[PDB]
């Protein structure tokens, strides 16, 4: 498609400008692995392979869906460095290197031992990136602690969307839902599990879950709820319990994020205010 081609060409990177270390895997997704690469004056970057997508139609659909990523610019949103097209193989997606990897592995690491304040700060950052994406009317559909990255300045990048989209930890995606496709059902809003529709308000639901992951330092949500039972569990009005070290007012925020009525849930702009106030009392 010539239109998709014009868009891609805005961000194309010539094969000569990119060195990829295929012996240095730093990420594993369903569409391909992530590698240490260098972009040219050498910039250290992360190179996401799409090679597992071999069908040209599907490659076209993925590029079509994710290309808008080049139009986003915000300190808490992961940016696109470019796309490297070559003579043999699927396009390589080139992204900025994130020195501290994904937020979930970061807060789970026991030498790190992040404080309550550090954790609420991380959540404030995500709230702000999500606030920007919502203002662009972009719906994420897979927000979770595993899907936010941390750069060398400990700035949190909302990630795993657009051209970087993939399943980077397979254990938390299940076919036990109405679509039959692999979905993150334990981060999904109740109405999304029922109607298969995703909105910014269902993103807010996910953000609530991510907040919970933060305060538990990366505990898996509903460890005792089988993927078969997640929908009925939420229908009965049950929710994630308050983490031991979560401040009461922040747990109140989580609960609002999981209000059964989508319209009744806060906006990300409101969440930035409330969490910013909570963070400041630390």
Length of the chain: 282
Contact between 206 and ligand 6XE by CB under 6 A: the answer reads: no
Dist CA 168 CA 31 (whole Å): 10
Nearest to 158 by CA among 105, 119, 207, 118: 207
Contact between 169 and ligand 6XE by CB under 6 A: the answer reads: yes
Q: Which span sits near ligand 6XE by CB under 6 A: 157-165, 170-178, 201-209, 264-272? A: 157-165
Q: What are phi and psi of 30, to 5 degrees?
A: -75, -30
Cβ nearer to ligand 6XE, comparing 21 with 178: 21
Binding-residue pattern over the window 8 to 27 for ligand 6XE, x denoting contact by CB under 6 A: ------------------xx
Q: Is 162 annotated as a binding residue?
A: no
Contact between 173 and ligand 6XE by CB under 6 A: the answer reads: no
> Is 167 in contact with 146 (CB distance < 8 Å)?
no
Q: Is 224 a catalytic residue?
A: no
Q: How far is CA 146 from CA 43, 49, 267, in A?
A: 25, 19, 22
> Is 140 in contact with 146 (CB distance < 8 Å)?
no
Which of 55, 71, 118, 142 is flagged as catalytic?
Answer: 142
> Is 186 in contact with 221 (CB distance < 8 Å)?
yes
Cβ nearer to ligand 6XE, comparing 104 with 265: 104
For residue 237, how many other CB atoms are within 10 A of its CB? 9
Contact between 98 and ligand 6XE by CB under 6 A: the answer reads: yes
- Contact pick of 18, 92, 127, 164 for ligand 6XE (by CB under 6 A): 164
Annotated binding-site residue numbers: 26-34, 48
Residues making up the annotated binding site for ATP are 26-34, 48
Residue numbers of the site for ligand 6XE (CB under 6 A)?
Answer: 26-27, 34, 46, 48, 95, 97-98, 101-102, 105, 146-147, 149, 159-160, 164, 168-169
């Amino acid at each position: 498609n010539p239109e998709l081609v014009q868009a891609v060409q805005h961000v194309v990177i010539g094969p000569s400008s990119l060195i990829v270390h295929f012996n240095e895997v730093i990420g594993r997704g369903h569409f391909g692995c992530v590698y240490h690469g260098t972009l040219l004056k050498k910039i250290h970057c992360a190179v996401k392979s799409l090679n597992r997508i071999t069908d040209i139609g599907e490659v076209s659909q993925f590029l079509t869906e994710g290309i808008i990523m080049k139009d986003f610019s915000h300190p808490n949103v992961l940016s696109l460095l470019g796309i490297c097209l070559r003579s043999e193989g699927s396009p390589l997606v080139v992204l900025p290197y994130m020195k501290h990897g994904d937020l979930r592995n970061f807060i789970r690491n026991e030498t790190h031992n992040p404080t309550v304040k550090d954790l609420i700060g991380f959540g404030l950052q995500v709230a702000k990136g999500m606030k920007y994406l919502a203002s662009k009317k972009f719906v994420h559909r897979d927000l979770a602690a595993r899907n936010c990255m941390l750069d060398e300045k400990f700035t949190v990048k909302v990630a795993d969307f657009g051209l970087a989209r993939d399943m980077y930890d397979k254990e938390y995606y299940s076919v036990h839902n109405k679509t039959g496709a692999k979905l993150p059902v334990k981060w999904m809003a109740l109405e999304s599990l029922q109607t298969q529709k995703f909105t910014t308000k269902s993103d807010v639901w996910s953000f609530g879950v991510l907040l919970w992951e933060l305060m538990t330092r990366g505990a898996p949500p509903y460890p005792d709820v089988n993927t078969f039972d997640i929908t009925v569990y939420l229908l009965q009005g049950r929710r994630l319990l308050q983490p031991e070290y979560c401040p009461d007012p922040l747990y109140e925020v989580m609960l609002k994020c999981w209000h059964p009525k989508a319209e009744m849930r806060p906006s990300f702009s409101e969440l930035v205010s409330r969490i910013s106030a909570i963070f400041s009392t630390f």
